[PDB]
Amino acid sequence: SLAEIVKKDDFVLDSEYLVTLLVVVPKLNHNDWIKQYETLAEMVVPRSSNVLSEDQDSYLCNVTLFRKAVDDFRHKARENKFIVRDFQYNEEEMKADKEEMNRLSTDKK
Amino acid sequence: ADVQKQIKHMMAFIEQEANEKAEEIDAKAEEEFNIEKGRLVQTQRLKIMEYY
Amino acid sequence: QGIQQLLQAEKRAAEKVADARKRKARRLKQAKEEAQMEVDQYRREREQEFQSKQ
């Protein structure tokens, strides 16, 4: 879960024409995805590629694209060994899930 | 350069959207009410002859 | 940068939807009274058939 790593500035609002998907990229294919983020789909942003969080094996990045071009970007990235993890308004519900994780420990106690 | 051109092509995808978002209802509802105001010619012409 | 100019140019497209309501606001309103301007076509019909009554 990304209930603590979520940021409103890390995503692009007003999803009528533009939306930023949380794209996971590996450490080996970090440079290969940086030279193919503009060519993954049509009407995708070529300057929105920026790492949101980083791990030891892979790196999580944000990729702004069109509303109808998210499927074309996720299809080519799945062929390019990249995964696209969806993020929505349920991150505020995931913040209540951390409170529900505290309520589960409160109910267990 | 290419980071600006895809931004500038997105402005073109806004402009071709803006032509689609300013002419659909502006052509349809201008033909909708022409039937409706034409009905206002027809709905009066029954009764205004009936008073005659 | 590219992400902030995209939204204000989207407001340009969101200003042309305000014209997409306006040209069906004014045109709905102006010729609604032009449909009431055909009452004058009835006002000539009554007064000219006032003569056939006379």
Curated annotation (Swiss-Prot), chain A:
Coiled coil: none
Localization of this protein: Cytoplasmic vesicle, Secretory vesicle, Synaptic vesicle membrane; Cytoplasmic vesicle, Clathrin-coated vesicle membrane
Tissue specificity as recorded in UniProt: Expressed in brain (at protein level).
Family in the record: Belongs to the V-ATPase C subunit family.
Function: Subunit of the V1 complex of vacuolar(H+)-ATPase (V-ATPase), a multisubunit enzyme composed of a peripheral complex (V1) that hydrolyzes ATP and a membrane integral complex (V0) that translocates protons. V-ATPase is responsible for acidifying and maintaining the pH of intracellular compartments and in some cell types, is targeted to the plasma membrane, where it is responsible for acidifying the extracellular environment. Subunit C is necessary for the assembly of the catalytic sector of the enzyme and is likely to have a specific function in its catalytic activity.
Assembly and oligomerization: V-ATPase is a heteromultimeric enzyme made up of two complexes: the ATP-hydrolytic V1 complex and the proton translocation V0 complex. The V1 complex consists of three catalytic AB heterodimers that form a heterohexamer, three peripheral stalks each consisting of EG heterodimers, one central rotor including subunits D and F, and the regulatory subunits C and H. The proton translocation complex V0 consists of the proton transport subunit a, a ring of proteolipid subunits c9c'', rotary subunit d, subunits e and f, and the accessory subunits ATP6AP1/Ac45 and ATP6AP2/PRR.
Protein name: V-type proton ATPase subunit C 1
Species of provenance: Bos taurus
Gene name for this UniProt entry: ATP6V1C1
From Swiss-Prot, chain B:
Location in or out of the cell: Apical cell membrane; Cytoplasmic vesicle, Secretory vesicle, Synaptic vesicle membrane; Cytoplasmic vesicle, Clathrin-coated vesicle membrane
Tissue-specific expression: Expressed in brain (at protein level).
Phosphotyrosine: modified positions: Y51
Subunit organization: V-ATPase is a heteromultimeric enzyme made up of two complexes: the ATP-hydrolytic V1 complex and the proton translocation V0 complex. The V1 complex consists of three catalytic AB heterodimers that form a heterohexamer, three peripheral stalks each consisting of EG heterodimers, one central rotor including subunits D and F, and the regulatory subunits C and H. The proton translocation complex V0 consists of the proton transport subunit a, a ring of proteolipid subunits c9c'', rotary subunit d, subunits e and f, and the accessory subunits ATP6AP1/Ac45 and ATP6AP2/PRR.
Family: Belongs to the V-ATPase E subunit family.
Function comment: Subunit of the V1 complex of vacuolar(H+)-ATPase (V-ATPase), a multisubunit enzyme composed of a peripheral complex (V1) that hydrolyzes ATP and a membrane integral complex (V0) that translocates protons. V-ATPase is responsible for acidifying and maintaining the pH of intracellular compartments and in some cell types, is targeted to the plasma membrane, where it is responsible for acidifying the extracellular environment.
Protein name: V-type proton ATPase subunit E 1
Organism (species): Bos taurus (Bovine)
Organism phylogeny: Eukaryota, Metazoa, Chordata, Craniata, Vertebrata
Residues of the full protein shown: 6 to 57 of 226
Curated annotation (Swiss-Prot), chain C:
Subcellular location(s) of the protein: Melanosome; Cytoplasmic vesicle, Clathrin-coated vesicle membrane
Coiled-coil spans in chain: 3-52
Ranges of biased composition (kind: Basic and acidic residues): 30-50
Tissues where the protein occurs: Expressed in brain (at protein level).
Function: Subunit of the V1 complex of vacuolar(H+)-ATPase (V-ATPase), a multisubunit enzyme composed of a peripheral complex (V1) that hydrolyzes ATP and a membrane integral complex (V0) that translocates protons. V-ATPase is responsible for acidifying and maintaining the pH of intracellular compartments and in some cell types, is targeted to the plasma membrane, where it is responsible for acidifying the extracellular environment.
Complexes and interactors: V-ATPase is a heteromultimeric enzyme made up of two complexes: the ATP-hydrolytic V1 complex and the proton translocation V0 complex. The V1 complex consists of three catalytic AB heterodimers that form a heterohexamer, three peripheral stalks each consisting of EG heterodimers, one central rotor including subunits D and F, and the regulatory subunits C and H. The proton translocation complex V0 consists of the proton transport subunit a, a ring of proteolipid subunits c9c'', rotary subunit d, subunits e and f, and the accessory subunits ATP6AP1/Ac45 and ATP6AP2/PRR.
Protein family (similarity comment): Belongs to the V-ATPase G subunit family.
Protein name: V-type proton ATPase subunit G 2
Lineage, uppermost ranks: Eukaryota, Metazoa, Chordata, Craniata, Vertebrata
